[PDB]
């Protein structure tokens, strides 16, 4: 039984295994960026998004001082 | 007219909103309001404290004197609450035909029940905030008077048994019923 | 490029087309039989909640969005008027709509409008073909190219897999077209009625179990034009808060007084009835003429079953009347497919008025109302749709008759039971696997609708978009349709899907949820009261065997 | 001292507010003071409700069901075989004059082939709502074809025609608006007006002076009121009336709406496909442009186009608003595909050639001239239909009705209004039933003696709000021959004379 359907390979399973074998030193940064982006309201914005990311980076630098 | 569905704009210094008729009241308010229902939910009472703490931290990051931080956070919180709750009159989406065109969110909370626990909490919060904050500007009398006036005339007077469905025509001839 | 192209159908062999439309069973061990609860009442369901910081973040995001939207609206419509010419008065004419009444659609929903209203083509079977498009500006307009790709179907109202192009139903429809043309003379009172309508009415009445029934072309109009026939200003209507819009429109057109009770609260209902019977009519304090209670069989948003025995006991004790909607329950629930009356064991003679719709499960368009003899006799003369609207065409009648005969078992033996067992097994397996992975799932143990909770707003678009890159179609709903905290994604299962497709879906959903941090389970979902964070391989290896046991489901 | 006292004052009031009344409720329209629990059960046990539906008058009003004709295993066409009274009586080869289909272009071979191909390649069921994977890229083509054919900017489809007007009008009106409507609108328009929740006025049937005076008075009052904003205003009418059959003076309405800044809503259920040189609608009849003449247009695809559904025409902004603000559009399933393809093919065919419209107009004019200039029926019946209409309506003279049944339209209207206002359970009127029985007797006599089937206006008097009287209807279509129609006219005239 064959149907005209194309299956997309799953990442981390025959995607990062056969084609290439590099998956280290970048998982932590990817996780941090994904958490920061998904837990803040950014997608429904347009260019007030830039202004808010600058705001948060400035809070960070000043408070760290 | 065979229906006589008109909105009146009677002019007087002090006025009240008329009681709704049988068709308007008993029949057009049956489904959830979806505007004041979110008040009594999970985590809907700690958000005020979280907002106050965040505002205090943000105003402290500038590096001002202790008095001005507290004065600024008090005024900004009270002004924001008044703007969000007591200013707009209506609903952001059609309900049935415009049945809630004359009531603010504070008057729509808990289906017009005067004394509910959430109203008690929302009235108690400003008093505690003022009592905590006034310890840092006791010496200066002008700041004390300004903060007291802002707390009483804006954060307490609109939340009263009287001044419910009360309208004043000084800023504009309002539409009652 | 701007207009949607007309796609020429592909040329494929018959067997490949059949495989595309309907799946093929692999092993006989993937079938489950549904039992009937004779004397067991429904316990109150338990819900699960995430930690507080999710709710706090949601509140902060909504506050920021509202403030920014209002500021932008004010500044833009104050400092420039040439661009906003559709919201301002012009030469003494008011605009079509208002600023404040359409704020949420203009400022919140227009940013992710590509997640709604996706054009498709072909039959909506197991695999659905979707047309490619490119968004311009911010979801303002779209550019279309000549490319279509298949995707797994999880967003269509196909419960028993009757949306097929090759089978007995299609042949019956073609023969009906050959015999009866597509023309309808007019209203059923003037010339419109034929013998096929009588046959369909008798078949529906025999299938449901009541004494008489009537059929209509549109399901929405059935509720829209029903309550004004036997209700007036001196009657009371008590209905649940989670009801469809058609019932509300019908009640509003009727003009009777309306009172509502909280979802799944029998004590509140009893108190309300006891108060209203004594209070009487307004301004005169005379007794009410009659009391009607409206309820739904299964709620599509949450998949919760109404408590029928308690309602029957209350209506017997207080002498009220009962109206039941069965849009999502007919032909898909119960040991045979009769509806909730078969699940609970309640005799169908106790319910006063029953409704149903043929769109969800029978692959047609129409609706039906079932009642006793004299009630139908009076309603036929007193109804408005009968003598003022059109009539349902022949091909839809033929399709519905063929579907009903197939489910009953008169023709093509051994097919209805197979489909019912497949859909039950698929629903139970998916629900158990999703609950074991660590997600949050609502509904009863065997419900075709599975809602998955996505509390944060920004997690709603991205998720869907990711599923578009992996050839899976989903549907998401949020405020104001649902409560502010609860934004969810709805899975609609079909009897055509195969277990391997379910495994593929499970792997992809597990990885996406792991990336997006969607696993938030408090341990109340498990039957042994512990947190469950299982591996995907172990879940796939162990869930199918344990899916049959009913001790692993809390509700 | 002074500072301490102020702090105590705020604290003391907080305790009083916390210990307030036990959740004081809202003053509703009904209330009863407290009474002893023990006597409550007596009130509960003494309650006696009414039956769900009244069965008292079912037997006397049940003759309407037994007289409904049923077609037997053949499509509805000019010649049919029918059975009545549960197969107790059967008639074969009966000429028909009660079919709403006029052009009869949906029974041709190309439309059948297109329908078969669409069914084979698409299925029968849409299986989805409007916004959830519902559009099957043929709805867009149909919308574009309708917009291009009728000379507008856009159109919106609807599953059923009876639920189109009550779904679009409430979306654009609310409390505080003004609606001026004619006193002869149909039942769906009345339902839409009732659900609109806005002020409604009525003016005389086709009288420009009354409309002008009403508009002038309303404009003067609105100008005197000095409102902060301009409310929405509308004018409600229709092209050809379903209960009467007259025509609307479009140029005068256009001039008035341009002068007094109003908007026009028009129902074109019975005018599209029958009026104009080609069949564009009412605008082509008066040689005008639909873009500026009419603001909202509602039409039905079942009367002449040949398939179920309806549509609403207009500009881009209105359609965009209707995409989300219409209850029927959002909360209903999509229309099937074969109907859409058949309607598109019919539109293409009608654009290609225009002979059916000419034949239909000739037949309608001949029928009206045949039933208009007969002197033997002057004392009994009257004609209330325009010559351009494709349906002929016949009514009884008031003198004859007063002589036989002894009642008048105003008395019936006021009696029905009083009964509706008092909300009576039983609503039965004798002279109305007698007149309906007389008309049914005429129809049965004609059918039995001459094998010709004609229809009678089927209305429900309970649901009506405006005055109306029973009448007879005769329909026509482009597929008939002049000789048969000429013979049938004389047959019906002979039957009418014989019955009276
Ligand atoms: C320290 C710094 C200093 C600086 C700063 O930051 C802080 O200071 C700050 C001070 C800020 C404002 C503070 C507070 C508000 C009000 C708020 O809430 C109203 C929101 C909307 C909803 O509510 C109203 O509207 C509903 C719908 O109509 C009413 O419904 C019914 O009302 C009646 C029944 O009850 C019946 O009539 C009917 O049934 C029905 O109408 C409802 O009653 C009524 O309440 C309204 O919004 C619109 O209001 C105007 C009308 O649409 C728009 O204007 C336009 O309108 C005309 C166009 O030709 C021209 O006349 C104007 O010139 C032209 O501009 C305006 O642009 C737009 O916002 C909207 C935001 C705003 C303005 C803030 C903006 C940002 C600042 C300027 C900051 C600023 C940056
Ligand atoms: C970007 C930067 C901003 C960052 C944040 C600024 C912080 C300001 C601090 C003020 C704090 C006051 C509020 C604290 C109490 C509320 C805390 C929880 C809020 C959760 C909100 C949940 C969603 C509610 C939706 C319900 C709803 O739709 N209600 C409608 C009623 O009809 C109205 O939509 C609504 O209510 C009023 C809308 C009109 C007022 C909005 C403000 C207008 C512009 C503001 C700019 C003012 C001038 C410049 C500062
Ligand atoms: C889905 C739904 C409908 C849809 O009716 P259609 O005529 O098939 O579009 C009707 N009623 C209910 C309760 C529904 O949930």
Chains C and D touch (3+ CB pairs under 8 A): yes
The number of C-alpha atoms within 13 Å of C301 and in the hemisphere containing its C-beta is 15
Give helix D2-18 / helix B117-133 axis angle, nearest 10°.
Answer: 170
Cα–Cα distance, C284 to C281 (Å, whole number): 6
C474 with C460: CB under 8 angstroms?
Answer: no
Closest by Cα among C503, C434, C160, C58 to C442: C434
For chain C, domains (ranges, CATH) are 17-42+118-158+419-546 (3.90.1150.10), 195-408 (3.40.640.10)
Residue C460 to residue C454: CA distance in whole angstroms: 6
In D173-230, which residue ranges form alpha helices assigned H by DSSP?
187-196, 208-225
3-state secondary structure D434-478: HHHHHHHHHHHHHHHHHCEECEECCCCCCCCCCCCCCCEEECCCC
Residue having the nearest C-alpha atom to atom 4 of ligand 3: D332
Q: Where are the domains of chain D?
A: 63-96+355-499, 109-352
User: Could you tell me which residues come within 8 angstroms of residue C116 by beta carbon, excluding any fewer than 6 positions away?
Assistant: C109, D131
The number of residues making up chain B comes to 177
CA C126/CA C511 separation, integer angstroms: 23
Q: Which residues pair with C370 in a beta bridge?
A: C213, C354
Ligand 1 within 6 A of B101 CB?
yes
Residue B47: which residues within 8 A CB-CB, separation 6 or more? C56, C59
For D366-430, the DSSP string reads HHHHHHHS-STTTTTEEE---TT-SSEEEEE-HHHHHHHT---HHHHHHHHHHHHHHT-S----H
Asked if B47 is an interface residue toward chain A (Cβ–Cβ < 8 A), one would say no
Q: How many residues does chain C have?
A: 555
Closest-CA residue of C relative to B37 is C483
Question: What is the Cα–Cα distance from D191 to C227, expressed in whole angstroms?
Answer: 13
Q: How far apart are CA C387 and CA C322, in angstroms?
A: 26
CA atoms within a 13 Å half-sphere pointing along the CA-CB vector of C379: 22
Domain D109-352, CATH 3.40.640.10 — does that match?
A: yes
With an 8 Å Cβ cutoff, is B101 touching chain D?
Answer: yes
Q: Which of C208, C525, C100 is nearest to B88 (CA)?
A: C100
Which residue(s) pair with D14 in the sheet?
Answer: none
Distance separating alpha carbons of residues D336 and D339, to the nearest angstrom: 6
Query: Can you say how many angstroms the Cα of residue C518 is from the centroid of all Cα atoms in its chain?
Result: 25
Closest to C333 (Cα-Cα) out of C427, C403, C400, C264: C427
For residue C327, the CA-to-ligand 3 centroid distance in Å is: 7
Ligand nearest to the CA of residue C246, numbered in listed order: 3
Ligand nearest to the backbone CA of C369: 3
Q: Does residue B129 have its Cβ closer than 6 Å to ligand 2?
A: no
Chain A residue numbers with beta carbons less than 8 Å from the beta carbon of C457 are 41, 44
DSSP character at residue C353: E
Residue C141's nearest CA partner among C114, C165, C180, C116 is: C114
Alpha helices in D48-199 (DSSP H): 63-66, 109-122, 139-149, 165-168, 187-196
Distance CA D245, CA B109 (A): 53
Residue C136 DSSP one-character state:
E
Residue keyed to tokens 């599923």: C467
A43 CB-near residues (< 8 Å, 6+ apart): C111, C112, C458, C461, C462
CA separation for the pair C137, C120 (Å, rounded): 23
- Cβ contact A37:A52 at 8 Å: no
Instruction: Name the 3-class secondary structure at A13.
Output: coil
From residue C417, how far is each of A37, C125, C314, C414, D151 by CA, in Å? 48, 20, 35, 6, 53
Residue D287, CA distances (Å) to D250, D281, D284, D291 in order: 10, 10, 5, 12
The four Cα atoms D177, D183, D188, D191 give a dihedral, to 10 degrees, of 50
**Within a 13 Å sphere around the CA of D105, how many CA atoms are in the beta-carbon half?**
25
- The structure tokens listed for A41 are 């309201």
CB spacing of B120 vs D18 below 8 angstroms: yes
d(CA D76, CA C156): 35
Residue C450 is classified by DSSP as: E
- Strand-strand pairing, D89-96 and D79-84: antiparallel
Give CA D90 to chain center in angstroms: 33
B62–chain A nearest CA distance, Å = 9
Q: Resolution in angstroms, to 1 decimal, for this deposition?
A: 3.1
> CB–CB of D264/D294 below 8 Å?
yes
How many other C-beta atoms lie within 10 A of the C-beta of residue C547? Answer: 21
Tell me the domain boundaries of chain A.
10-65
Q: Return the bridge partners of D79, or none.
A: D95
Give A25's contacts (C-beta < 8 A, 6+ positions apart). none
Check whether the bond before C136 is cis (ω within 30° of 0).
Answer: no
Q: What is the largest CA-CA distance in chain A?
A: 66
To test the pocket of ligand 3, the residue of C217, C226, C244, C248 to mutate (highest count of ligand atoms within 8 Å of its CB) is C244
Note the CATH architecture for domain D63-96+355-499. Answer: Alpha-Beta Complex (3.90)
* Nearest-ligand number for the alpha carbon of C85: 1
Contact D358, D151 (CB under 8 A): no
Our answer on whether the CB atom of C80 is closer than 6 Å to any ligand 1 atom is no
Backbone angles phi, psi at D155, to 5 degrees: -145, 150
Q: How many Cβ atoms sit within 10 Å of the Cβ of residue D487?
A: 14
Does the CB of A5 have a partner CB in chain B at under 8 Å? no
Q: Tell me how far apart the terminal alpha carbons of chain B are, to the nearest angstrom.
A: 18
Q: Are residues C45 and C555 in contact, defined by beta-carbon separation less than 8 angstroms?
A: yes
The tally of CA atoms less than 13 A away on the side-chain side of residue D457 is 19
Whether B84 is in the pocket of ligand 2, judged by its Cβ within 6 Å, is yes
Residues with CB under 6 Å of ligand 3 are: C 218-220, 244, 246, 300, 325, 327, 357, 359, 365; D 332-333
Would you call B11 an interface residue with chain D, using a CB distance cutoff of 8 Å?
A: no
Chain B positions in Cβ-Cβ contact with residue C255 (cut-off 8 Å): 23, 27
C-alpha C516/C-alpha B164 separation (Å) is: 47
Selected residues 208-267 of chain D with any CB under 8 Å from a CB in chain B: 227
Q: Between residues 370 and 409 of chain D, which touch chain C (CB distance below 8 Å)?
A: none
Task: Say whether C511 and A8 touch across the interface (CB within 8 A).
Answer: no
Tokens in use for C23? 């799946």
Nearest CA in chain D to C476: D132
Residues 270-289 (C) with a CB less than 8 A from some CB of D: 274, 277-283, 285, 287-289
**Alpha helix ranges (H) inside C324-457:** 340-344, 373-382, 385-388, 394-408, 416-437
Q: Is some CB atom of chain C closer than 8 A to the CB atom of A30?
A: no
Nearest to C52 by CA among B42, D398, B134, B91: B42
Spatial separation of the C-alpha atoms in residues B76 and B79, rounded to whole Å: 5
**Any B CB within 8 A of C470 CB:** no
Instruction: Spell out which residues of chain C touch residue B37, defining contact as CB-CB under 8 Å.
Output: 483
- Look at residues D83, D159, D74 and name the one whose alpha carbon lies nearest to residue D332: D159
DSSP states along C284-317: T-PPPS-EEEEEESB-TTT--B--HHHHHHHHHH
């Amino acid at each position: 039984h064959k149907s005209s359907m194309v299956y997309i390979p799953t990442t981390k399973e025959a995607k990062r295994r056969n084609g290439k074998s590099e998956g280290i030193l970048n998982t932590i940064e990817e996780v941090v960026e994904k958490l920061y982006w998904t837990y803040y309201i950014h997608l429904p914005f347009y260019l007030m998004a830039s202004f808010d990311s600058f705001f948060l980076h400035v809070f960070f630098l000043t408070i760290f001082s | 007219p065979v229906t006589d569905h008109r909105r009146r704009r009677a002019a007087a210094v002090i006025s009240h909103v008329e009681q709704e008729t049988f068709e308007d009241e008993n029949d057009q308010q049956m489904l959830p309001n979806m505007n004041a229902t979110w008040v009594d939910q999970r985590g809907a009472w700690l958000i005020h404290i979280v907002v106050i703490v965040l505002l205090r931290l943000f105003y402290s990051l500038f590096g001002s004197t202790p008095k001005w931080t507290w004065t600024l956070t008090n005024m900004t919180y009270i002004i924001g609450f008044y703007i969000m709750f007591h200013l707009v009159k209506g609903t952001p989406f059609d309900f049935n035909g415009g049945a809630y065109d004359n009531l603010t969110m504070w008057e729509q909370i808990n289906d017009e029940t005067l004394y509910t626990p959430t109203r008690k909490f929302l009235l108690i919060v400003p008093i505690v905030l003022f009592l905590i904050s006034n310890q840092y500007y006791r010496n200066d009398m002008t700041l004390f008077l300004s903060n007291l006036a802002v707390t009483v005339l804006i954060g307490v007077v609109p939340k009263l048994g009287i001044t419910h469905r009360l309208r004043i025509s000084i800023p504009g001839i309002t539409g009652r019923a | 490029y701007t207009r949607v192209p007309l796609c020429e159908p592909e040329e494929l062999p018959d067997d490949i087309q059949k495989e595309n439309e309907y799946g093929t069973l692999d092993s006989p061990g993937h079938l489950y039989q549904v039992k009937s609860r004779h004397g067991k009442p429904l316990p109150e369901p338990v819900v699960d909640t995430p930690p507080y910081y999710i709710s706090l973040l949601t509140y902060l995001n909504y506050l920021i969005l509202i403030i920014l939207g209002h500021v932008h609206d004010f500044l833009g419509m104050t400092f420039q008027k040439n661009k906003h010419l559709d919201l301002l008065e012009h030469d003494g004419l008011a605009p079509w709509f208002s600023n404040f009444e359409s704020f949420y659609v203009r400022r919140i929903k227009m940013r992710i409008d590509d997640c709604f209203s996706r054009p498709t083509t072909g039959v909506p079977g197991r695999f659905i073909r979707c047309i490619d498009r490119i968004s311009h500006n911010i979801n303002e307009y779209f550019t279309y190219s000549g490319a279509v790709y298949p995707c797994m179907n999880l967003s269509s109202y196909n419960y028993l897999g009757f949306a097929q192009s090759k089978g007995q139903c299609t042949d019956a429809a073609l023969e009906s077209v050959d015999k009866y043309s597509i023309q309808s003379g007019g209203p059923r009172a003037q010339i419109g009625t034929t013998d096929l309508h009588i046959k369909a009415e008798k078949l529906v009445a025999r299938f449901i179990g009541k004494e008489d029934a009537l059929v209509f072309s549109m399901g929405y109009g059935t509720n829209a034009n029903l309550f004004n026939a036997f209700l007036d200003k001196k009657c009371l209507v008590i209905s649940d808060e989670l009801n469809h819009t058609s019932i509300r429109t019908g009640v509003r057109l009727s003009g009777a007084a309306v009172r509502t009770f909280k979802h799944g609260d029998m004590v509140g209902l009893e108190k309300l009835i006891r108060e209203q019977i004594v209070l009487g009519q307004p301004k005169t304090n005379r007794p009410w003429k009659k009391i009607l209670i409206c309820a739904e069989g299964l709620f599509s948003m949450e998949g919760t079953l109404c408590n029928l025995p308690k309602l029957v006991e209350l209506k017997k004790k207080y002498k009220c009347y009962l109206f039941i909607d069965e849009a999502h329950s007919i032909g898909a629930m119960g040991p045979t497919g009769r509806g909730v009356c078969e699940i609970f064991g309640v005799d169908p003679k106790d319910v006063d008025i029953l409704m149903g719709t043929f769109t969800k499960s029978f692959g047609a368009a129409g609706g039906y109302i079932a009642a006793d003899q004299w009630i139908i006799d009076r309603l036929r003369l007193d109804l408005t749709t009968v003598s003022y609207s059109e009539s349902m065409p022949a091909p839809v009648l033929a399709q519905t008759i063929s579907s009903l005969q197939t489910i009953s078992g008169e023709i093509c033996p051994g097919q209805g039971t197979e489909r019912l067992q497949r859909i039950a097994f698929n629903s139970r397996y998916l629900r158990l696997a999703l609950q074991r992975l660590g997600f949050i799932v609502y509904g009863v143990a065997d419900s075709p609708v599975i809602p998955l909770l996505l509390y944060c707003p920004s997690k709603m678009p991205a998720f869907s978009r990711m599923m578009l890159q992996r050839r899976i179609a989903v549907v998401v709903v949020a405020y104001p349709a649902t409560p502010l905290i609860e934004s969810r994604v709805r899975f609609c299962m079909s009897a055509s899907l195969t277990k391997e497709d379910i495994d593929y879906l499970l792997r992809h959903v597990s990885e996406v949820g792991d990336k997006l941090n969607l696993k938030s389970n408090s341990g109340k979902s498990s039957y042994d009261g512990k947190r469950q964070r299982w591996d995907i391989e172990e879940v796939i290896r162990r869930t199918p065997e344990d899916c049959k046991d009913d001790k692993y489901f809390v509700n | 001292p002074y500072r301490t006292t102020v702090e105590i004052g705020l604290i003391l009031y907080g305790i009083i507010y916390y210990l307030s009344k036990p959740q004081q409720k809202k003053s509703l329209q009904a209330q009863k003071p407290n009474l002893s629990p023990q006597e409550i059960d007596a009130l509960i046990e003494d309650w006696e409700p009414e039956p769900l539906v009244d069965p008292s008058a079912t037997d006397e009003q049940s003759w309407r069901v037994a007289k409904t004709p049923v077609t037997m295993e053949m499509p509805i066409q000019n010649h049919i075989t029918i059975t009545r009274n549960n197969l107790q009586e059967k008639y074969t080869n009966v000429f028909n004059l009660a079919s709403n289909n006029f052009l009869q272009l949906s029974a041709t071979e190309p439309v059948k082939e297109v329908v078969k191909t669409t069914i084979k390649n698409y299925g029968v069921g849409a299986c989805g709502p409007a916004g959830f994977y519902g559009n099957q890229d043929v709805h867009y083509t149909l919308e574009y074809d309708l917009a291009q054919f009728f000379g507008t900017q856009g159109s919106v489809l609807y599953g059923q025609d009876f639920c189109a007007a009550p779904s679009v009008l409430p979306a654009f009106t609310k409390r505080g608006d003004v609606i001026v409507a004619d006193d002869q609108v149909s039942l769906p328009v009345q339902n839409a007006l009732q659900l609109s929740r806005s002020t409604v006025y009525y003016f005389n049937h086709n009288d420009m002076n009354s409309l002008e005076c009403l508009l002038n008075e309303l404009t003067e009052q609105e100008k005197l009121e000095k409102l902060p904003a301009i409310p929405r205003k509308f004018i409600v009418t229709e092209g050809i009336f379903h209960n009467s059959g007259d025509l609307a003076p479009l140029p005068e309405l256009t001039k008035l709406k341009n002068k007094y800044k109003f908007r026009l809503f028009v129902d074109e259920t019975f005018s599209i496909g029958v009026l104009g040189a080609t069949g564009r609608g009412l605008s082509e009849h008066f040689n005008m442009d639909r873009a500026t003449a009419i603001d909202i247009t509602v039409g039905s695809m079942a009367t002449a186009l040949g398939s179920t559904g309806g549509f609403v025409l207009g500009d881009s902004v209105m359609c965009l608003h209707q995409r989300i603000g219409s209850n029927a559009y959002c909360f209903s399933a999509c229309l099937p595909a074969y109907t859409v393809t058949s309607v598109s093919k019919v539109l293409k065919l009608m654009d290609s050639n225009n002979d059916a419209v000419q034949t239909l107009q000739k037949l309608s004019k001949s029928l009206h001239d045949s039933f208009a200039s007969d002197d033997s029926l002057r004392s009994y019946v009257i004609v209330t239909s325009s010559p351009v209409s494709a349906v002929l309506h016949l009514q009884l003279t008031p003198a004859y009705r007063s002589r036989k049944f002894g009642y008048t339209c105003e008395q019936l209207f006021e009696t029905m209004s009083a009964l509706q206002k008092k909300s009576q359970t039983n609503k039965f009127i004798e002279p109305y039933e007698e007149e309906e029985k007389f008309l049914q007797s005429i129809v049965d006599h004609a059918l039995i003696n001459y094998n010709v089937l004609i229809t009678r206006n089927t209305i429900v008097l309970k649901q009506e709000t405006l005055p109306i009287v029973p009448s007879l209807k005769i329909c026509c279509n482009a597929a008939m021959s002049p000789e048969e129609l000429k013979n049938a006219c004389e047959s019906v005239k002979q039957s009418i004379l014989a019955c009276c």
